[PDB]
Write an enzyme that holds these catalytic residues in place. Sequence first.
Site, short mmCIF file in Angstrom:
data_model
loop_
_atom_site.label_atom_id
_atom_site.label_comp_id
_atom_site.label_asym_id
_atom_site.label_seq_id
_atom_site.Cartn_x
_atom_site.Cartn_y
_atom_site.Cartn_z
N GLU A 11 0.83 -1.20 0.00
CA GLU A 11 0.00 0.00 0.00
C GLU A 11 0.87 1.25 0.00
O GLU A 11 1.95 1.26 0.60
CB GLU A 11 -0.94 0.01 1.21
CG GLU A 11 -0.25 0.08 2.56
CD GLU A 11 -1.21 -0.13 3.71
OE1 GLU A 11 -2.41 -0.34 3.45
OE2 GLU A 11 -0.77 -0.08 4.87
N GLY A 22 -0.43 -9.90 5.92
CA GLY A 22 -0.30 -10.64 4.67
C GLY A 22 0.95 -10.34 3.87
O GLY A 22 1.69 -11.25 3.49
N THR A 32 -5.45 -8.65 16.84
CA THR A 32 -5.89 -7.61 15.93
C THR A 32 -6.67 -8.13 14.73
O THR A 32 -7.55 -7.44 14.23
CB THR A 32 -4.67 -6.79 15.46
OG1 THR A 32 -4.07 -6.14 16.58
CG2 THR A 32 -5.06 -5.72 14.45
N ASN A 57 3.82 -7.23 21.25
CA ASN A 57 3.37 -5.92 21.71
C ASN A 57 2.82 -5.95 23.13
O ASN A 57 2.93 -4.95 23.84
CB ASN A 57 2.30 -5.39 20.75
CG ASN A 57 2.87 -5.02 19.40
OD1 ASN A 57 4.08 -4.90 19.23
ND2 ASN A 57 1.99 -4.84 18.42
N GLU A 68 29.35 -13.62 14.87
CA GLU A 68 29.55 -14.31 16.14
C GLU A 68 28.25 -14.71 16.82
O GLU A 68 28.21 -15.73 17.52
CB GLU A 68 30.39 -13.44 17.07
CG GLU A 68 31.75 -13.07 16.51
CD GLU A 68 32.59 -12.30 17.50
OE1 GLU A 68 32.16 -12.15 18.66
OE2 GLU A 68 33.69 -11.85 17.11
N1 LIG Z 1 5.23 -3.07 17.46
C1 LIG Z 1 4.53 -2.66 16.41
N2 LIG Z 1 3.57 -3.49 15.87
C2 LIG Z 1 2.85 -3.09 14.80
C3 LIG Z 1 3.07 -1.85 14.23
N3 LIG Z 1 2.23 -1.72 13.19
C4 LIG Z 1 1.47 -2.83 13.09
N4 LIG Z 1 1.85 -3.69 14.08
C5 LIG Z 1 1.31 -5.03 14.37
O1 LIG Z 1 1.54 -5.92 13.29
C6 LIG Z 1 0.35 -6.61 12.96
C7 LIG Z 1 -0.27 -6.05 11.69
O2 LIG Z 1 0.63 -6.23 10.63
P1 LIG Z 1 0.70 -5.15 9.45
O3 LIG Z 1 2.09 -4.57 9.39
O4 LIG Z 1 -0.36 -4.09 9.62
O5 LIG Z 1 0.44 -6.03 8.15
P2 LIG Z 1 0.89 -5.50 6.70
O6 LIG Z 1 2.38 -5.66 6.57
O7 LIG Z 1 0.46 -4.07 6.48
O8 LIG Z 1 0.12 -6.51 5.72
P3 LIG Z 1 -1.18 -6.07 4.89
O9 LIG Z 1 -2.31 -5.80 5.86
O10 LIG Z 1 -1.58 -7.19 3.97
O11 LIG Z 1 -0.86 -4.83 4.11
C8 LIG Z 1 -0.57 -6.41 14.13
O12 LIG Z 1 -0.32 -7.38 15.12
C9 LIG Z 1 -0.18 -5.05 14.64
O13 LIG Z 1 -0.42 -4.96 16.02
C10 LIG Z 1 4.04 -1.02 14.77
O14 LIG Z 1 4.25 0.08 14.27
N5 LIG Z 1 4.77 -1.43 15.86
MG LIG Z 2 -0.91 -2.78 5.14
#
Ligand SMILES: Nc1nc2c(ncn2[C@@H]2O[C@H](COP(=O)(O)OP(=O)(O)OP(=O)(O)O)[C@@H](O)[C@H]2O)c(=O)[nH]1
Ligand SMILES: [Mg+2]
Lengths: 48, 177, 41, 430, 80, 275, 442, 442
Positions: free
Chosen positions: H70, H143, H178, H205, H253
Amino acid sequence: RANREKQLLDYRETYQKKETQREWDLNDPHWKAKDLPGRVGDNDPRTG
Amino acid sequence: MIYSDNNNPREDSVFLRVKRAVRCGGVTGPIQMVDFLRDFRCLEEEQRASGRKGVTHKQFVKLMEQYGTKLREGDAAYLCKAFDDDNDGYINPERFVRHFTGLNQRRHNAVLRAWASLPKDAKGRVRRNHLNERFSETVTHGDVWGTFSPTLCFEEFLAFYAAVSVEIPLDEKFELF
Amino acid sequence: RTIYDALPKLPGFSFPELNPPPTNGIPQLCTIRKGIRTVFD
Amino acid sequence: REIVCVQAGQCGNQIGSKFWEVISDEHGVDPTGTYQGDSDLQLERINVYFDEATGGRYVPRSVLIDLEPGTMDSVRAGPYGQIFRPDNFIFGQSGAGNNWAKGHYTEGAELIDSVLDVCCKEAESCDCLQGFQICHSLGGGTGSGMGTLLISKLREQYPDRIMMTFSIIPSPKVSDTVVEPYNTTLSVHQLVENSDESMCIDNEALYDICFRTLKLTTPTFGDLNHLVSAVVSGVTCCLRFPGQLNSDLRKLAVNLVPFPRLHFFMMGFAPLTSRGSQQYRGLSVPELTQQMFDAKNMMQAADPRHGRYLTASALFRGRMSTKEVDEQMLNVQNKNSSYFIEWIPNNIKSSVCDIPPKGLKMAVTFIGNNTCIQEMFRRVGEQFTLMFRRKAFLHWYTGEGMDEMEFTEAESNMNDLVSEYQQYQDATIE
Amino acid sequence: MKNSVARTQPVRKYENFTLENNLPLALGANFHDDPICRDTNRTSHTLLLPRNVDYAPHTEYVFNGGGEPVFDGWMTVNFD
Amino acid sequence: LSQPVSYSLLVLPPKKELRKKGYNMTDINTTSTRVHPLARWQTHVLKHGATYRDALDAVEEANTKHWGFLKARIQFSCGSFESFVRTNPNDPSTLKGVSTYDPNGVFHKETLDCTLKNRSTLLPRLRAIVDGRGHHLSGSTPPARSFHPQVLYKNCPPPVLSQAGYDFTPMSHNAFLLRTNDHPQGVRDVKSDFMKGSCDYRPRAYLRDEVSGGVNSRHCHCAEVYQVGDYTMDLARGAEIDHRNRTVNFEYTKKGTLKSGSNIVGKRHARVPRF
Amino acid sequence: REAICIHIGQAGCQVGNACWELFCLEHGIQPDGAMPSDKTIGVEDDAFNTFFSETGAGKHVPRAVFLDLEPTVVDEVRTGTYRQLFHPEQLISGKEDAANNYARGHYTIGKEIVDLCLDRIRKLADNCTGLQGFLVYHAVGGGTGSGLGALLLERLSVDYGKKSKLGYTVYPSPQVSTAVVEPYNSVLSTHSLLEHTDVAAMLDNEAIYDLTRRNLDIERPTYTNLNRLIGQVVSSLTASLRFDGALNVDLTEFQTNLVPYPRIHFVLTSYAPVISAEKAYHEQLSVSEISNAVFEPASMMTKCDPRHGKYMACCLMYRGDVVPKDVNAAVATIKTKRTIQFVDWSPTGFKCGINYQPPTVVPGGDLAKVQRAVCMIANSTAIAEVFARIDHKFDLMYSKRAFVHWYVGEGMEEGEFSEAREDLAALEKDYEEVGAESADMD
Amino acid sequence: REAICIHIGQAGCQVGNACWELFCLEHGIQPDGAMPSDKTIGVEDDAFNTFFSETGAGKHVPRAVFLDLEPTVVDEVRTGTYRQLFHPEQLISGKEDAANNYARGHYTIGKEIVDLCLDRIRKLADNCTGLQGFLVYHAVGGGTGSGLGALLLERLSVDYGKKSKLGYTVYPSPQVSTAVVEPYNSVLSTHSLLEHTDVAAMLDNEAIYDLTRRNLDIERPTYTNLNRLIGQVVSSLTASLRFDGALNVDLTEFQTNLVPYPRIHFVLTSYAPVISAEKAYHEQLSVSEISNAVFEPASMMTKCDPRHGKYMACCLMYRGDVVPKDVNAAVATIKTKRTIQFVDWSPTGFKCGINYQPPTVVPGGDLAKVQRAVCMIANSTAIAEVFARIDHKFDLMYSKRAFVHWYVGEGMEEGEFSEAREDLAALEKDYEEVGAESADMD
Ligand SMILES: Nc1nc2c(ncn2[C@@H]2O[C@H](COP(=O)(O)OP(=O)(O)OP(=O)(O)O)[C@@H](O)[C@H]2O)c(=O)[nH]1
Ligand SMILES: [Mg+2]
Ligand SMILES: Nc1nc2c(ncn2[C@@H]2O[C@H](COP(=O)(O)OP(=O)(O)OP(=O)(O)O)[C@@H](O)[C@H]2O)c(=O)[nH]1
Ligand SMILES: Nc1nc2c(ncn2[C@@H]2O[C@H](COP(=O)(O)OP(=O)(O)O)[C@@H](O)[C@H]2O)c(=O)[nH]1
Ligand SMILES: [Mg+2]
Ligand SMILES: [Zn+2]
């Protein structure tokens, strides 16, 4: 040598501006904002 | 040539033509370049006095035509856009001054060393009558004394010795000279 | 005469860009004409 | 005892310009031709490389040949270019195209008579003639073809003099030209018959010299040609200055060549050292000898550890005792005894000359005859066989007119040369 | 390195050095290795970077040590 | 094959001058190889059309020309020569030459067997196998055409094409896959600058089946196993390499040409599905 | 020293306009044909001579002809900005176009104009003292470019001899298309061009559009951009004749290094620092980066993928501030890669050139200013796919005799279709066989 | 010396913003990469080189790529404060997301986008001279992060070979959740990650929320706090490359010391002086106190309790004003504890590192200023409990094929679910077997 490349960068920044290019009228963003429709009102001189 | 080699990467062809026109016109060329800088400064001072923030495009090209530049189709707008930073119909003075008196690194350092040699007083500005008798027999280009308005500042000094830079094609010879 | 050329000709003591050429062209100082060679300067 | 130089092709003319700069500096000749030197010792042997012109002027005993004048026009326009005699520039009207057959047969035979006329005019003017010295590349077109043509003609006309060549040879790692194996093989075939002694240089070895020893940040061809000009002017130094143990090109040849086909040598020059390091090591004869035998300082890709030295020669410049020179050469022969051919009781000749090059306290140039040169020829012959089986690019050479039998003869003769080196490497007394 | 060519090996202080302060190098007195005695902790590839030099060169190097009577008749005699 | 180019002569000074210097007329015959102290060498140049016959005639002319002459030498263009001497000194009409020397006699005699071995090896390889138009001969035809999927990509991954980043017909991309760390025999370790050696980037398929459990997922088809045409290519089943990313085995044909490795493991008998 | 440029048809004249604009600005000849006021006999100033000759009054005039059958483009040149630069005799124009028919150009219309062209070229060649080849610009997709270009190259090849002929050629794009009859004209052109050219460099507009979208930031490119890129490549290749350098390369050296067999003369071209001013400040532009750039197929000006073939020879031209050790290190790094493959009969795959003059910057241009550049021309077996794709479209059209009555009516025998198609089939077989490994051939 | 960072999807790009903020401020590069108008070089020393490269004019640009399907997050980076730092080619964005489908990322869409990413990474790797690994930041719950991260790691593993790949991975928390489909994506990710990663560090998290409530005083935390903590951890681990120290630790290492068998590469991470400004002036913070802190489960960034398992190896990184004798005394005291147990086949359980540079303070940050910190990564059998709960939730959903038609529609065989589930079951049995005492087996 270092000052040579610094001056080359100065040249690039000042003489090669984006709007300077000959084809700016085609690649310009907001090109439809600056133009007019086909006919404006009922006394448009352009509508021959 | 001068605008294509790596030694002087700041040069541009059309600006080189403008400088050639203002130098070879018509009182010798370096005097004309110092006069051009003086007219630019007084014009910008008058505009600042009036209440407008800088010289416009129309009087800039009028000044160029007054000094005798045989411009072509589209080059005037090219220079006007080149030196307009905020893109509001105004010419930036500091950029134009930096480009007008431009020089290579070695030549600029030579000019700086020479300027640092001479003595100054008051607000960093020299006088002709104090030093004309001391350096009379060693200054081959006597036009320096004509440049004095019996006073002179660093920008006029740099403009004068940038004007003469075209006559000496070697950097080492320029430094020793 | 000057500190830029006051060194002996030994390897590693040459600094080519300190004497940059003011031009890069090829003159025609060596011509054939109608078969009579000229090496004019 | 004066030498005549010939410079052929782009590489030859460029190296020649740096050579004549170095020689003019050592004898104090201004680029106008005026003597400006600072000791009578410089003047009393000036004849060796310069001919005497009438007024205040000196002229250099050199013939310049090329097929298109572009290089000649660049060197003539250079800072020392004026010294050269205008009548000494011989040129055609179209290039060699890096093709041996064109350079040898069509424009070669067209120019060669005018080149021979200039060489004879220069030779018959000498009161006593020493050998010729030729610089050219073997991978090129006019260099290889016209150089070997001229060498063959001079060997017909001057069989009693010495014939010495400096030659640039293709790197093992990267080619500069697609058709190098053909031009190299045909030129080596011509040279091994015609030449008396030939030195070979890899540009890759000079790159390794520049990067490892001198640590230059931005080397240029002027540096490589300066290294070459240094060794070339060093081999002849004892010819033209006094010394405790004189030497001569003919005496070098007599001591270096055991059998007439085995005349290909490696070169090195010792006091090479980076601007940072000079504070760490004073000059002395052991230091020069150690650098002299270090393969880092050798100008070919083959390494001595895979072969054996038949003979070697060292020419020392500077004020030094003969005892350290003799004992260093003995110690190196004794300590590395497996790398020296055992049926010769002493492989190294030494020579000592009083006058070093300006700004160095001492210098030595090294010439080495080592069997490891056979691997380079083997590599070139392999690439030739790869190209020939597929008739690679062959129509250019056949269209000029060469018989293929020339190619098979030259390949067979070079292959016999590699076999001969291999047999003498592994020979034994029994 | 492939960075800017104007970089030079930096300058380090290493204060509290016994050998510079008219003292013996006694056991348990290597203060110059204490991190509080340094001015920076940034590692710099000194093995590739060049050094800085400032001097006025010599401008010249020496290599040698510095170092009518016509007859037209009329014969005359002088005893000088 | 060779032709004469010059003939050399050794002579004594005239009889009256030899008597004037004080040397005896007789006692010139000796069994030693040394010569009289007053004998001088001189040489002459033959013309282009000269052969052995007229050179020998010139030597005989010199023999009958003047007194004080017993040595001769005829030089060929190959560097060899033969000598002519008088069987009986101070007596003409007995000239006969028994000698033959060349600079490359012992040199060629000692290096004989290796030369014939290498000549018997190399010369069959130099025979042309391609027509002058770039076409193969009637014998030894290749088993398959060149642009076939398994021939062109025998030991190299095929390209992957995608529309991303392009407006028209897409183009593939280069990869960073290095080659085997092999160096020519007897070449110094050359570095013009800092190069990326192939000792590192050693593939992870080395000893995979021994120190590890081998492939345990079908994801090998994503980046390691390819379906090229009618066959299968596998990057883990090529030429054997050692721990330092160097080729272990070298193979040759009957005539002695190096044979490249192959990654093709198997043939897939594909059929359209029917009832 | 001298080279003569021949510009044919619409693409060739417009690219000629861009080229001569560039060559003027690089040497410094003003649009009115005058050296600048600071140049005199004070210093030696001759580099122009490769492309310009001076009159006795000191005006400069260029060593070129412009050939067209329609007036409009040459009348644009006559009425344009460079009116005073060209001699009016150099601009030759007919009455009516070849209407996308190769047959009309070759048989009907070009035969009338061709004798004037040979007389003009002869008049140029008489005013030379070291002519060393012809550069030709044309498109093989249109009628006059194909027909008159072939006829003129045949006549030049008869009159002149042992002289090189280097072509820069715009081929029909593999899915972008401008006319229906493109396959017929391209096949018949390539048939005539095969016998009578020494090296042919291929360009495709679809690839250069992709390059201007990808590298430059132009959303809506037009032919002037494409023509400026072509002008830069030609200036880079001919710079070796005109300026000082470490390793010069004469035009005869290209044919010797690039062509293994006399039919195998079609080469790929690419140019490295195609970059915009805004990108130029995010990146250093070292020798190794631009050397890596010239080998990506995204850099190429013809729509072919070299990964579907094997390289036989490469020629690398470096211009600007480059040091030989970096050229050697770059070429040695490329050679290591496994996705770049050379035929086993070509072990010494590279030719190098090194020139000191950096590329010139044009006031309205879109390329950044850079201290160094590298340009590549290379010979590869991948080209067989370009001919195979043209030949499939030819077979599709000829299977139904789709347009043949036009070609037969304007004077050509139908047999010429079968001859040309058989020659291209044999060229395909040459490219199939040449790529076969020697170990399998025994 | 150098390392290249790859940021994938939403979590990886957002964590990247905090990382590059910290690395800029720690080295001293301005947010736009320029320098003051009077200086000739922006900084005196080369230490930045591990993460930044400078152009010959002295602008800095960072060694990173940002990958997303995206546009929105990358467009936020393009319009933010660091606009001038990044090269625009490095910020890669697709048209549409992988919609929480591993199958959509892996088969349909990431397969299209992956070749641009590989070309950008190659362009980075060509501008290096001692690359010693890849650092990857992604979440396995979504995903595109799962599917494209796996596909890209597979391609990287073929192309670069032996070079190390270290992952920082956000796994699905054990009761905070989530999205519904998290178990399928996490199982299939872990299946791909087993073969193609050298060490994987797992984060949850829920643990960082607990850490920010107890130690920091934040009532309403958001992802920027967590991302700043992650950035601090990465800076601590990579500090050993960049600053002077007593005991350095190269990235190679870690894999040698932490991984006993090739499947056992999942490690726990914790950080000691996570503390608020009000608490920091009430307490001394000696070496032994923070060493005692790192073993308490209140310090961990993953929700697992190590008291329910056995340690195989520990790697302790100390940075700041620490003396080796205190580190040795602390580690011996830790070794004395009875709730800390090592497998009897691993007698020498520890690796140490000691670096002199104290942690940097960020203007908007929430951590206090402290003179020393320690960071630990450790391998322990307790990790088996996280997989067992993910596998049970997968089994619950898969018994009715609850969502499988999406995955099959986006290109995946149904068989892949069952295969992955047996591989994770075998990983569970591996963790049972490795933990069996040698004295018990005789
Ligand atoms: N620690 C942390 N977790 C995050 C963050 N952003 C999203 N997450 C977590 O990662 C998961 C969501 O994954 P996303 O990164 O949104 O998935 P994506 O890579 O965008 O994949 P698509 O939805 O298909 O576009 C959830 O468990 C969220 O809580 C972040 O900035 N920091
Ligand atoms: Mg996304
Ligand atoms: N690169 C480039 N391609 C062009 C240009 N002009 C035309 N083309 C292409 O060349 C093909 C058309 O060929 P033309 O040159 O118009 O044909 P022609 O030579 O005028 O032949 P006639 O129509 O018979 O007069 C199409 O593929 C166009 O896209 C140009 O200025 N630059
Ligand atoms: N060392 C050195 N090598 C050179 C020089 N000029 C060219 N070469 C090399 O010589 C070969 C080209 O041969 P060239 O002189 O052009 O052959 P020609 O065309 O017959 O004159 C290549 O390997 C070049 O790298 C030079 O000045 N110095
Ligand atoms: Mg037309
Ligand atoms: Zn996969």
